[model samples]
Target chain A: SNPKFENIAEGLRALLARSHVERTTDEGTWVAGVFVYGGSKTSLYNLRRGTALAIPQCRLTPLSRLPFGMAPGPGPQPGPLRESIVCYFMVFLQTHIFAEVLKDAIKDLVMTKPAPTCNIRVTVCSFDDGVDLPPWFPPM
Target chain B: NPKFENIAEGLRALLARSHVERTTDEGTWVAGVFVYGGSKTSLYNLRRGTALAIPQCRLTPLSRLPFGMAPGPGPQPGPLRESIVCYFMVFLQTHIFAEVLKDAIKDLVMTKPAPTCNIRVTVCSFDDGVDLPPWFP
Candidate 1:
């Protein structure tokens, strides 16, 4: 654990630095990594004000990906909050665990066989400096 | 509203049979027909199980029967528990009300908008009926 944190710190300064900062809210032992470097140079790529990093999940978490009873909507209607939120688990869960979410609906979930390959995408948006969803942005 | 009582009667019989014939701690219910013979034998000559009971609707119990999972045994070499279940739902889901308990779990009891078909079949084949006596079979 000690060396892991040391390596993470070293990574932050060396491999990360200007590219992006991987900070964890961990009050105890620090657990962070330069998960991805979308790039940082202000030339070809200046970290924009509101650019999101969409990283497809290494595996699937189908059920957690979406809410129950929510019929798939027509083109771009809006992303299901349930599915979107579940996408966050991509971090905590290794690519393997997240794969279970896409199993099936409850009816299908229990009965469905495990999938060899799951359809998945985990997106992490990295904001430039300071920016966030407006206070009223989150829907009730 | 018009036919609540009649539907209730039918439900009463089905549910009662299910409980009365609960297979001694096994699959939810046992499928056995009351061989009403002698006088009722003639009655059996007509429609046996309920099919055309009119004015039906008080509880729909729109069960969500999504067997969208992968098949149990691919290539169907052995017991395809998954596909078998999915097929079971396809069979029971005739009315979009009652769910096929095969391959499907009890969760089918939940429905959407509910169906006029109040009849529900619960499955509990933990010990699906053991081999009955051959003579009594």
Candidate 2:
């Protein structure tokens, strides 16, 4: 296994761990290094308003394993570069399917006897990480 | 061009922006995200190393836009997921190419002393509406 998939778990962990309570800033959160493993995996790396759990490591897979000096064929090849691309791409694609399905299922939750201008918009997922934002983000 | 490919590539960008990063045992001097960027992309987000210059970006031709969606011009569609598979298949295919080619590059370079590692790496196409981690992050 090239461990490319494992890399995604690592990157998300970095983001959550570094997300801090920057009370001075408007965004309320900050960036993490892209990888980190705290004392225990259960420790949700703190984000601005909540903690972000790491992407489970079970999903990572090897794209390819070319023989020494032999080129990898026209498939997901093995290399750090390919590993990085596949990791991010896989996360992006899967989450979109998730969002589309969830949005359809929760269609009712959005418009509930509105409070006039109050649109209870949900911050379901960030374009980058599928992790939902904290309440203050949208401002109830 | 086609919806699925556009969707797939776009989603990949979003994932790339938010994925995790950690120190690997590759070596002390080698603490890069074990993940690999599309070797041909110019919009490569720099990893923590001495890449001689900006990363490479190689986009497929427009006709090949939905390479995944557009099947081979044959009698049968070949496979149901043929188009979809091809789309992902193309990149993964290129991934294989880059991996192979780069090795040749490194090998040819190492043959000489003071040969520049000049290693260039890239991830996203840097398009708008794409996900992005904070620069510092």
Candidate 3:
């Protein structure tokens, strides 16, 4: 993956993490949303809410777990680079949105670059009440 | 600017009509994304008409440790393990599709130490005209 694409993916992940926390805390008012960052121009789409609330900058700390095997020290562990990013989007999107939409959005995001150069787009959604999640998504 | 009430609507609009055609194709294809490390195997995103397996890969296995228990300075315990195995389906059979899927699977399983887990991929497609019996009821 190019540095530009990786930067976009990392930025999106941070945004989604913040969005997930915000939606959980703000009752049901803050619905899942998407963001399209096209170089200078950026678009934010809130599913139910009109415009997205300002997301506060906060540190994301990993939850403590019992050390198992040869667990590496602090910081991100190494793994498949691009695949991990795709999996994160797939699992997260599919968990919150319709499978058809998840498939469509991921294919578009993964297969193509944003129209103008250096553009990034992200969509966030969650399962409605009483929808079965895919095997890859972590249980709520 | 297209106004969409929800994510599904918005994403559907954002995606290109041409790209959408690939996933809507006819025929059955299976893709498995597996990660091995944790002693317990948690399955996610299992839809109807899907199958599961405990397949092996070249990645090194880590010792299985008890929950919340940090490993001591001594040698680790026995019973090495890998983490998760996920399966999903795709309709199109293209190089880009394969590359994307492979990358997603790699990312899903491999994290932290970078080469924490090795990935093995197998994809089967029933696009042939031959009419075979259905595997699921």
Candidate 4:
């Protein structure tokens, strides 16, 4: 409802909407990529503005290029503050991931059983120059 | 109001107490990754036993799988369902990757509205070992 959360949700909606349109329609390449780059940005943007003070940002290396929810690999476990913030940004990419998965399933069903030489494939990535893990964690 | 409410709820649950009494389960460490495209969209690249769920994250029918099915020129072959269910023998327990997933969805919701591709997460994981015994042969 609020603009702060609204934008991130809108981003997810836009991404999923795109996923459906491209998968079914006839205007796309053989492959697709939806790079989500908004939600965490808003959160961090507000964080910088010092809006929500209870949550702390754990700036480790540069922000992780890996998609949200993807495990950060075997590293130090986050503390309450870090984990909560980490959890905050974590769900940011649900629609992206879900929509991307749907697109793939649709492509699989549409492509001929024999498997044509060229077929549609979609990949999703999220990039945020936002915070990373705490300095205690891995190197960026 | 609804946008970040879901995230707020999840956060509340996550931060509810000092330690959520954790349970134990088992599953072999399966390899998984990203299937990058030449462009933006990519598939959830999974390898080894990690291929159990994708797309909707359920136990997909064997026929629908890229692997674990009879040879179809390209799709890899895999074990029979009976084998996987009844005879796979080694049952590895592990925790379901839940909070991260909720966070992902919550994050998405904060950005927009809802219906992020009909995600239905079953609170189950091969890792967090809660396998039910089979009925017959």
Candidate 5:
């Protein structure tokens, strides 16, 4: 059980590492990664500075039915990848907000697309104040 | 505002209300808390998401866990301790904050022995829409 999950998580770590970028500002260090899985594209960025905030409130969108038995795409598969993605977000965000965001994104991806893929972008900023930042992108 | 404290408190509450039973077995039972996030309905349904067991000997607590902790005097703490402080430097990660909750549990069990000798709790967060393993109840 763990071996398969570990393999998938390792693949995700490598994928994120390949595209990982960091920027240091007055506030703190900003880490970002961009990767594509299945047919969907995901962009993850977190402010890796200061202590995590206290109990943060989360707002979740309406739930939708999840599609079944989708083909594996260019990146890691979905079933296990879903767990990996949530765990990845938790490592940095340390809050339930990422879970809600990913839940909505994944449901939309599978329900709307013919090929089960969509865009998932999340940004976490500020440590003292738990404020949700808008999606951030590298200057390139 | 310490997320570690919040997580520890949550775990404490869950354990307080959980159904724990003593077994004839001699090994420690490590349970993974699967946290699911999504719509209100699904979230409510998965409030107490399934727990997966990781078996280990009584002497070693940290063995078979995802991350590692430095060599310490007593047994190493569980993954919950490691995950909360994982982002910090190796030295910082091994601070008392990580083990305080585990120690509290240890002290409680010491005062009044329970059916289970050693039980460790860890967490794995997930989106609500993801299909859980068939084994999940």
Candidate 6:
């Protein structure tokens, strides 16, 4: 049986329990953690934003076709230095797509028009786990 | 003779700002957003013209952004909550932009030599935002 997926639900539950608030000088971003427990399960230990949520079944079938080591299995194990890359990737992608698609809706409701001069904007950064990138990756 | 000279300086500055490191195998990935009161705004693109918006202070609802946040002032006057929600939303865009650059670099690298993976970065202003597709889900 696929025992790995079984723990996923439990892992999700446990993660939601204690997730915490991460604050920045300007804004606050909720943070979470996830761990792959081999077999078929990825465990998320987060109780809220801090707790962890994992993807069980431990396999990235969609990524299987991709050349990079992103695909899951006993191989990479989500144990890579940038493993956190997965968690942020999911959350960030969702927001970016929403922002792109919902631009009109945002203008209609959210904030009163910024006026004829001001415009809306967003910024972000991501670095490969030092190991995944080449030595020259940095200092560039 | 140095095409990447300008890009190199910016990369140097960015890397210096955040030296991403991976020391543990806990598989823990953490990210956060911060909002501040401000007026200036800007937008940027890395390599293949992937759009990225810098966060600006404005009144935005938490629900409008991507995933829900656990803590905040809840709901109140627009000024009180101000641009926090907007900042958070924009950061999410940053995440997307990063991936865009990462994938582009990876593809270019795979197709040719590492040095040939040269990419360009650009900056500009963002309009109201893109329209959502009807089939969007």
Interface RMSD of each: 16.3, 12.4, 20.2, 14.8, 17.5, 15.7
Candidate 3 segments whose C-alpha is farther than 4 A from its true place: A1-140, B1-24, B30-39, B42-96, B112-137
DockQ of predicted candidate 1: 0.01
Q: What tens-digit string does per-residue lDDT give for candidate 6 at A1-140?
A: 33433343354434333432221113222121111111111121121121112322111111111112454332434434433322211122112222232222222321333332112211232223211211225654
Clashes of 5: 1
TM-score of chain A of each: 0.20, 0.19, 0.23, 0.23, 0.23, 0.20
TM-score of every model? Answer: 0.19, 0.16, 0.19, 0.16, 0.16, 0.17
lDDT tens digits, residues A37-139, model 1?
1111221011111111212222212122233233455534443443332211212212222222221111121122222112222233222332222233656
lDDT of 6 at B134: 21
Q: Give per-residue CA lDDT, model 4, range B25-117, as digits (tens).
A: 333322111111111110121111223222212222121113244322222233333221111111222233343433333343244322322
**CAPRI grade, predicted model 6:** incorrect
Q: Candidate 2: misplaced stretches above 4 Å?
A: A1-140, B1-98, B114-137
Model 3 score (lDDT): 0.29
lDDT head-to-head 3 vs 6, winner: 3
- Candidate 6's C-alpha runs over 4 A off are A1-140, B1-11, B17-24, B33-85, B89-137
TM-score of the B chain in each candidate versus the native B chain:
0.21, 0.21, 0.28, 0.22, 0.21, 0.23
Model 5: per-residue Cα lDDT over B1-137, one tens digit each: 24334433544554454434422242223322322122323222222221111021011111222456433211234445523211101011112322333443444333332322233322322233223233455
Q: After superposition, how far is residue B34 of candidate 1 from its true place, in Å?
A: 19
Q: What does candidate 2's lDDT look like per residue over B22-115, in tens digits?
A: 1223211111112222222211222211122212212222111122233567554334332211111111112333343334333433443331
Lowest summed lDDT over 10 consecutive residues: which window, candidate 5 chain A? A46-55
Q: Answer with 2 or 3, whichever has the higher TM-score.
A: 3
Q: Which residue window of length 10 is worst by lDDT in model 5 chain B?
A: B85-94
